[PDB]
Amino acid sequence: NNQLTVTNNSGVAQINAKNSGLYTTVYDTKGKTTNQIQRTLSVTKAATLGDKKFYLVGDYNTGTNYGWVKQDEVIYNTAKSPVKINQTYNVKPGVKLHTVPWGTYNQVAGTVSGKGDQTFKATKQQQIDKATYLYGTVNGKSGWISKYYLTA
């Protein structure tokens, strides 16, 4: 017996490169491969059709519905209330800025000069699963950067 128990969820996720695909419906049609093959966007919803855990992926910021996907093939990462510090640090030179929290191989906002510390003003922070990606501005670009990339 299976039943679509529809449930909400606040987090982010990326589906693996060697996936089945993205499930436009929970009953599925085909599950088609797309850009989300280690591209983090956001998780707006997460229901279970019986045992089958489907994570609804949405727009990076707004959470605009793109479709569901199986738990087997995803890396789901939780999120919490963001933090605000305006404390300006220097960013380590060579650091690659990421467009979305968790910041996978298909989320690059930019990169800093190999040798040359740039003034990174943080205006925001995001608490995602394990990693804390801060947000700020580096020479016209704006994006997320883990505290492990950022110099203290």
Swiss-Prot record:
Assembly, per entry: Oligomer; forms a ring structure at the cell surface which is important for efficient partitioning of daughter cells after cell division.
Q: Native species of this protein?
A: Staphylococcus epidermidis
Stretches of the chain forming a coiled coil according to its record = none
* Stated role: Endohydrolysis of the di-N-acetylchitobiosyl unit in high-mannose glycopeptides and glycoproteins containing the -[(Man)5(GlcNAc)2]-Asn structure. One N-acetyl-D-glucosamine residue remains attached to the protein; the rest of the oligosaccharide is released intact. Cleaves the peptidoglycan connecting the daughter cells at the end of the cell division cycle, resulting in the separation of the two newly divided cells. Acts as an autolysin in penicillin-induced lysis. As a bacterial surface-associated protein, mediates attachment to polystyrene surfaces, contributing to biofilm formation.
Q: How is it modified after translation?
A: Undergoes proteolytic processing to generate the two extracellular lytic enzymes, probably at the septal region on the cell surface.
Stated family: In the N-terminal section; belongs to the N-acetylmuramoyl-L-alanine amidase 2 family. In the C-terminal section; belongs to the glycosyl hydrolase 73 family.
Q: What is known of its domains?
A: The GW domains are responsible for directing the proteins to the septal region.
Subcellular localization: Secreted
What is the protein name given in its UniProt record? Answer: Bifunctional autolysin
Question: Domain named GW: which ranges?
Answer: 5-79, 81-152
Organism superkingdom: Bacteria
